[PDB]
Amino acid sequence: VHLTPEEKSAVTALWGKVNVDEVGGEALGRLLVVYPWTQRFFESFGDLSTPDAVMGNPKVKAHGKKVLGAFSDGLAHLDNLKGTFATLSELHCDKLHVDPENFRLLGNVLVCVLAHHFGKEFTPPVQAAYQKVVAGVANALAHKYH
Amino acid sequence: VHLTPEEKSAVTALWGKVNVDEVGGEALGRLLVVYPWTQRFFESFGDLSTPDAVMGNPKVKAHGKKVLGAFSDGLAHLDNLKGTFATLSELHCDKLHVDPENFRLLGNVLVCVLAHHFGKEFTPPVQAAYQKVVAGVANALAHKYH
Amino acid sequence: VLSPADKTNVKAAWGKVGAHAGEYGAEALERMFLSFPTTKTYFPHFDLSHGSAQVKGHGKKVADALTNAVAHVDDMPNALSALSDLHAHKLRVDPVNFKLLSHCLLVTLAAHLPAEFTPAVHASLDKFLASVSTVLTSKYR
Amino acid sequence: VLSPADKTNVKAAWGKVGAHAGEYGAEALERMFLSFPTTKTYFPHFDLSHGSAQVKGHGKKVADALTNAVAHVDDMPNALSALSDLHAHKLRVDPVNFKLLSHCLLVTLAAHLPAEFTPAVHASLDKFLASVSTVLTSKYR
Ligand code: HEM
Ligand code: HEM
Ligand code: HEM
Numbered sequence: 361v362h363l364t365p366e367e368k369s370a371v372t373a374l375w376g377k378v379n380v381d382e383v384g385g386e387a388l389g390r391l392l393v394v395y396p397w398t399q400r401f402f403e404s405f406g407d408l409s410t411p412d413a414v415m416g417n418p419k420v421k422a423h424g425k426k427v428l429g430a431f432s433d434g435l436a437h438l439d440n441l442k443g444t445f446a447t448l449s450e451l452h453c454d455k456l457h458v459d460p461e462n463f464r465l466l467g468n469v470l471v472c473v474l475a476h477h478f479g480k481e482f483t484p485p486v487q488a489a490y491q492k493v494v495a496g497v498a499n500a501l502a503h504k505y506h
Numbered sequence: 507v508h509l510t511p512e513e514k515s516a517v518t519a520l521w522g523k524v525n526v527d528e529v530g531g532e533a534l535g536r537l538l539v540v541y542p543w544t545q546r547f548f549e550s551f552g553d554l555s556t557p558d559a560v561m562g563n564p565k566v567k568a569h570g571k572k573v574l575g576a577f578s579d580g581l582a583h584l585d586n587l588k589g590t591f592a593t594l595s596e597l598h599c600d601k602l603h604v605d606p607e608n609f610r611l612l613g614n615v616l617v618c619v620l621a622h623h624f625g626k627e628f629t630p631p632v633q634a635a636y637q638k639v640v641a642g643v644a645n646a647l648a649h650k651y652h
Numbered sequence: 653v654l655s656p657a658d659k660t661n662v663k664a665a666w667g668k669v670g671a672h673a674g675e676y677g678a679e680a681l682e683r684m685f686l687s688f689p690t691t692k693t694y695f696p697h698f699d700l701s702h703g704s705a706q707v708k709g710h711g712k713k714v715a716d717a718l719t720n721a722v723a724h725v726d727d728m729p730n731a732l733s734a735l736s737d738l739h740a741h742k743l744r745v746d747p748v749n750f751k752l753l754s755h756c757l758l759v760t761l762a763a764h765l766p767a768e769f770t771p772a773v774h775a776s777l778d779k780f781l782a783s784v785s786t787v788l789t790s791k792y793r
Numbered sequence: 794v795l796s797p798a799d800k801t802n803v804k805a806a807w808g809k810v811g812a813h814a815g816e817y818g819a820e821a822l823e824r825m826f827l828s829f830p831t832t833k834t835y836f837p838h839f840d841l842s843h844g845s846a847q848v849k850g851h852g853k854k855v856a857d858a859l860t861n862a863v864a865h866v867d868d869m870p871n872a873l874s875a876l877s878d879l880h881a882h883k884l885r886v887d888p889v890n891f892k893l894l895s896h897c898l899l900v901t902l903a904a905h906l907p908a909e910f911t912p913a914v915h916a917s918l919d920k921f922l923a924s925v926s927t928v929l930t931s932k933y934r
């Protein structure tokens with residue numbers, strides 16, 4: 361992936377205001393509501409019957425913080441996303457068997473939760489930089505499939 | 507891509523019986539017919555209005571011959587697909603801007619053509635062997651997007 | 653949206669399957685499992701090896717689902733309602749997979765019916781199988 | 794397939810766009826051109842830079858199209874037939890692209906209407922845009 365410095369600046373700058381304890385559980389909660397088939401991987405999480413049940417599910421909020429961490433890590437290692445996500449690619453590809461299209465969907469649902477919290481602050485040039493980010497993350501996360 | 511020696515034997519065995527002057531035009535033909543949005547990249551070929559026009563268009567036949575030549579190439583370099591298709595990747599990704607989802611679709615059509623041409627001799631095992639192959643190629647062609 | 657033509661092609665094409673309806677189905681399942689392993693994970697309770705009498709039996713099931721769709725091409729959402737619920741709700745099948753089975757079924761028909769599988773028929777089946785697929789993935793919630 | 798709730802939701806949300814209709818559509822478009830540069834090639838005749846009178850013009854055109862779908866949610870294939878023909882026959886837009894734009898539309902909506910963009914409603918809008926994309930792509934031949 362290729363972020364120009366200006367892009368990097370825009371990205372971390374907005375990241376620096378991100379509520380890392382909720383944002384993650386928001387994006388994962390939405391992904392389970394918007395694309396219902398992903399709920400196949402979380403039968404252990406319990407109550408996922410309504411949107412309200414999904415967003416207020418502790419495990420969701422909990423697991424989300426996890427995922428969000430994965431990203432923060434990508435953000436700090438923009439130039440070696442492959443190495444950064446090596447063990448998670450084997451977990452989601454060889455073990456869980458999650459379709460890499462789903463990684464693209466998740467990365468997109470986040471770009472949604474980002475624009476939603478930052479409003480006018482998430483400008484088009486800012487979104488274009490974050491799009492290069494989630495693209496690099498899904499691509500590397502799907503490396504055990506390439 | 508990961509082909510076992512048994513797979514490499516079934517693949518190349520079949521491929522040796524392939525008519526290199528026709529099969530490519532057949533597949534590129536069907537791609538145009540079945541997935542129409544792909545004609546937008548062939549305006550210069552002229553008549554593509556109907557199946558027959560498409561199948562009879564000498565420009566389609568000839569361009570197909572070319573396409574088939576590139577696959578034969580990958581077949582002889584299964585362990586270095588990325589390089590084999592380096593220039594074609596720049597061409598189709600950086601210059602033409604073809605969504606990579608269409609490399610997959612053209613690979614699948616080829617498979618249908620082979621199924622059509624060999625009949626029973628194109629066993630489920632030989633198909634899995636060729637799927638790996640087209641998958642490899644579609645991935646080596648999209649490298650400039652990764 | 654299937655045109656009169658597609659409807660005619662699909663019907664005529666399917667009708668050359670006859671007694672082989674089930675066998676072809678099974679063969680399409682086998683090609684899927686072998687080409688796309690990730691699919692196998694929806695059947696941990698089936699032995700997926702050659703000659704598997706479980707696969708053979710599921711094959712018949714699917715093939716009938718399609719013949720049903722074939723017969724009710726103008727009322728597909730309603731015809732397969734029951735099956736859409738199963739796949740989306742209980743089975744939670746990832747939609748990307750229907751493309752995969754749809755592909756294997758075509759590949760199967762191409763290998764068995766060389767005289768029918770013309771470019772145009774090929775296009776009709778694909779729209780058909782894609783319509784079927786759109787229905788079985790219309791019930792996620 | 795849209796449910797009554799999806800319907801009520803989408804309607805409700807869209808309603809809060811008001812006189813901003815053409816302004817948002819123009820933004821979504823820009824968003825798309827920037828994040829997904831491949832889509833720029835469908836408009837060699839437009840100047841796509843920020844503030845482009847053309848983009849502004851086209852955005853509104855797009856904004857109306859969607860309002861029409863909203864108004865004719867129960868008869869979408871028909872309401873949009875004219876445009877379906879335009880995108881597939883004449884324009885030959887890759888079906889992949891109706892997904893990129895449907896995304897840039899959701900993005901723009903959340904960036905301007907946060908009190909409306911709840912998870913339930915986001916669900917609705919996604920299903921909507923997908924229905925639309927389904928129709929503008931239902932005519933390839
Ligand atoms: C961008 C995408 C994703 C990121 C970065 C990510 C991140 C992670 C993290 C950091 C863990 C915890 C691993 C631990 O306990 O060491 C995890 C576990 C898991 N993830 Fe994801 N994930 C991604 C996508 C997905 C998707 C799309 C699914 C299914 C739809 C999924 C299913 C799972 C499951 C089921 C576990 C639990 C595994 C276990 O404890 O045995 N993940 N993921
Ligand atoms: C597996 C996939 C494919 C293979 C191996 C392949 C192979 C090739 C070959 C060998 C050439 C000729 C290059 C020459 O003149 O040096 C070519 C040209 C071209 N291909 Fe493909 N192709 C693939 C997929 C596609 C798709 C999917 C499209 C569009 C839908 C496409 C569009 C083009 C066009 C428009 C040209 C002509 C470029 C020019 O002469 O300026 N290709 N391709
Ligand atoms: C053309 C598309 C498809 C058709 C017509 C179809 C048809 C059917 C039929 C008729 C059943 C039996 C329903 C019961 O017994 O009521 C079934 C079951 C099922 N299908 Fe499909 N199916 C399709 C695609 C898929 C795909 C793509 C997958 C996954 C890769 C899948 C996974 C399953 C599973 C796991 C079962 C249940 C197996 C049982 O638990 O034993 N189906 N399908």
Ligand code: HEM
Nearest residue numbers: 832835836838854855858859876879880884886890891894
């Ligand atoms: C939500 C999806 C879309 C809607 C509602 C839509 C709407 C429209 C409208 C209303 C027109 C004007 C029709 C004339 O003047 O009758 C148009 C034109 C056109 N659209 Fe779209 N469109 C969509 C997606 C796309 C996509 C994805 C692309 C390509 C990336 C595209 C490319 C074009 C082009 C190139 C024109 C003609 C521009 C003129 O030649 O000047 N459209 N569209």
